[PDB]
Design a protein around this ligand. Structure first.
Ligand SMILES: CC(C)(COP(=O)(O)O)[C@H](O)C(=O)NCCC(=O)NCCS
Ligand SMILES: CC(C)(COP(=O)(O)O)[C@H](O)C(=O)NCCC(=O)NCCS
Ligand SMILES: CC(C)(COP(=O)(O)O)[C@H](O)C(=O)NCCC(=O)NCCS
Ligand SMILES: CC(C)(COP(=O)(O)O)[C@H](O)C(=O)NCCC(=O)NCCS
Ligand SMILES: CC(C)(COP(=O)(O)O)[C@H](O)C(=O)NCCC(=O)NCCS
Ligand SMILES: CC(C)(COP(=O)(O)O)[C@H](O)C(=O)NCCC(=O)NCCS
Lengths: 158, 157, 158, 157, 158, 157
């Protein structure tokens, strides 16, 4: 069965990769969906983020990476996908997640949003933390794949 | 007794209408006050928002709609109003509401901020949700009055 | 207009007294209702609590003190009261309040639960904290009326 | 694929039944597991709760109801089940759920705890609310299956 | 400078040991104070707990282990200690810690309660979790010192 | 022992001054570090903020005021400081403080971030609140030092 893992992935972290790998143990097919969050000004374009994720996930079976500019549930409806996966961390805004899950279900009544728990080691990181630290030249090697560390380093020069 | 229900109402949703109606069961006179939130960029002007609300509330007795550009407690002091009504949702920033209630009371010692609980159906909606969904062409009809759905549709063109 | 301010008041604190005083600015008649909480083992009997509160509020106009053993909304329906007042503190279980308000409104549709915010000075106290400190002989004089400090002291000799 | 939906179910509510029906959209087999919570004193025995749930879910395909007295992950390991399903409400202790998910995953590395969101209607109810209202003679009919309203009625005599 | 690390320590976990080690990098003298929490029924007596802690910390310099049955601030006042150290975890009741810090500062105005953050790995563990798991015969080896795993095993036979 | 109290101090409030005074009873040397928060647009420059704080703390022994534009831990590493002090309020985003403490300790393994509790009177105030109220011409006298009230008044003209 198919699921979508939607997110800004700006950039993708090792926490995200963990959720992807784990989600694949429940859903045979996973779409990692780089989707526009209108409440964020992103560092990387949607396509830059897609290419990064593809490099990073390159030898996982069962995973496809895509981008979406519109209403999330329209992507799912169009492709006949009825499951959304999201990760929950200690630093997650829980009411935000609930609000969106409930809103999405109202817009798409067949939808199920399924949450996995971040492991302890990734429960307090975020893309935002990663970018902030990299932008001041800190080491983010333990939080992101090497592809992403390179990409961040370049963007901090450009 | 008179109370002010202050908010961005950008736009007013069914959750807001519910708090208005319920607040009127306690306070015989309610001022719905469209007030500037300096931490928000608003979709509709203060006056567009007043007009929607007036259309929406248009046969409710006991309600007046107004706008205010300054310090909220100044409106209440000038009009002799000593009660502020606000709604509490599952998705409400509780510390923000407390902070603001306490700051307002510091500024205006006779003030009481009184909170009502949003019903379950409205406890996870907000104007922000409504606008985001409308802006991507989703149906917001379950969350807003039809006057507002119309207004949002126009604004999105 | 009539309102009920229901609670364990076990014992009543200066924080409760503040909410009573403030609620009386909005509601002409206030019933302070000593109500059984089935999730607590109380220190004082319902009647001991009623008596302390009466001593403590003795010269406030507009306040009546009463006790109730049953379903809270039944007290209100019986007496034609449609407003419940509760205080909100930094240490309040917000979800429990919200749950109870919404349950109470499902049981009694005309009901409105209204919340006042505890002042900063009382926003981190509770009857529980008071009892625990008095139990170990600490001074609770800044948190409770003198009558209550007295009653606590006696109870911790018994 | 099999999952276990573990809980006190003391008693089962319409919120739990909703999660069960929805989980069955994802998992082909669901074990509803009446499991001992050592931080709770139950109203009904584990076996009373099992019988109630079996009455309630009687014509749902794909569900089994069972009881477990020990460590949750031991039941899953024993039966080769590697998914746990839980529900998330507005009134859920989030940090408790995370703790327990993380602890269970430590104890059983192949485990995944999967969370579904309770609908708005069921996001502010709990078994504990139901029992407290029932015990004071309040109507809990909109929160529990009729079977459970009956059982609560009897127990309170 | 002297500090007290007060707690139930029922039993001491690796999370507590981490806080102790780290607090010693700031405070040259640390008193680990096994103190009675009246809102808990403890598994081990205060003396059992002291003994376990002493076994566990046996070759740490700068640490003393003690017990206290009364009001915490009375121990501190008696011994001229003005700093209390507590740990903060993702599963900490933050309002309970604040309440108690503020209450303690009210009862002893010179006191400062200082909080350290638990590491990610210990941020979701508690003595309570440990005891629940052990009680049902689960491995708590990664969460407690071996002395404690042994003590827990014995207690679960007794 | 030396500690850094880092913050935007935009502007410094009486709550910050209280944490400074109290931190000085534990740490014989305190550096108040005006540091860039990249998630905020500041009202005052780093140097305006440094100068305010210096006026405000002028007769406190043991305190130095400084500014830093980069990674916070780099300031500490450079100066051999291994303690960071922060304040906890009712209105503090706890998860954010935790996240940053843990991240900082990852980047600088000798570091301890140590938290003091804001007194009740300061537990619901913030520089943001102050700015918002001052902006609308409200009295912020009870929340900031008179030097800061003045500075805010100027800025608003
Ligand atoms: C990108 C995301 C999925 C949120 O993910 P994020 O937390 O990784 O930013 C986004 O907010 C989203 O859903 N965008 C599309 C708009 C939409 O479908 N719904 C918003 C109303 S629920
Ligand atoms: C509009 C509102 C009442 C907030 O309502 P909102 O949550 O609907 O945005 C606003 O923040 C407000 O009070 N605005 C300007 C006046 C003021 O006094 N602000 C300081 C509050 S301490
Ligand atoms: C005593 C109290 C008011 C709670 O107040 P407390 O927080 O002061 O203990 C009580 O829990 C209550 O409302 N009712 C007792 C019985 C009842 O009505 N229970 C169901 C409420 S949904
Ligand atoms: C605690 C509970 C009964 C279920 O919780 P519920 O009461 O929230 O429905 C849970 O299912 C459980 O696991 N009980 C058995 C003991 C166990 O495995 N404990 C360690 C959990 S980390
Ligand atoms: C031991 C502890 C610090 C709590 O520690 P714990 O949270 O590890 O159980 C305890 O509750 C305590 O202080 N006990 C004695 C009673 C007291 O002095 N104060 C509570 C009044 S603020
Ligand atoms: C960002 C901030 C100034 C926050 O302080 P504030 O809460 O007073 O704004 C913080 O003190 C800090 O660390 N800033 C510098 C940038 C940095 O080092 N960021 C990585 C945070 S892990």
């Amino acid at each position: 069965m198919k699921a979508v893992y939607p997110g800004s992935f700006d950039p993708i972290t090792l926490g995200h990769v963990d959720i992807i790998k784990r989600a694949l143990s429940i859903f045979d097919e996973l779409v990692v969906l780089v989707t526009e969050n209108p409440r964020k000004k992103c560092m990387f374009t949607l396509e830059e983020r897609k290419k990064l994720i593809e490099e990073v996930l390159s030898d996982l079976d069962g995973v496809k990476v895509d981008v979406h500019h519109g209403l999330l549930v329209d992507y799912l409806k169009k492709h006949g996908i009825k499951v959304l996966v999201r990760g929950l961390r200690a630093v997650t805004d829980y009411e935000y997640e609930l609000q969106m899950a409930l809103a999405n279900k109202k817009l798409y009544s067949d939808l199920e949003t399924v949450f996995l728990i971040a492991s302890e080691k990734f429960s307090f990181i975020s893309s935002s933390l990663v970018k902030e630290v990299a932008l001041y030249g800190g080491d983010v090697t333990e939080w992101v794949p090497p592809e992403v560390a390179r990409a961040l380093n370049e963007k901090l020069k450009e």
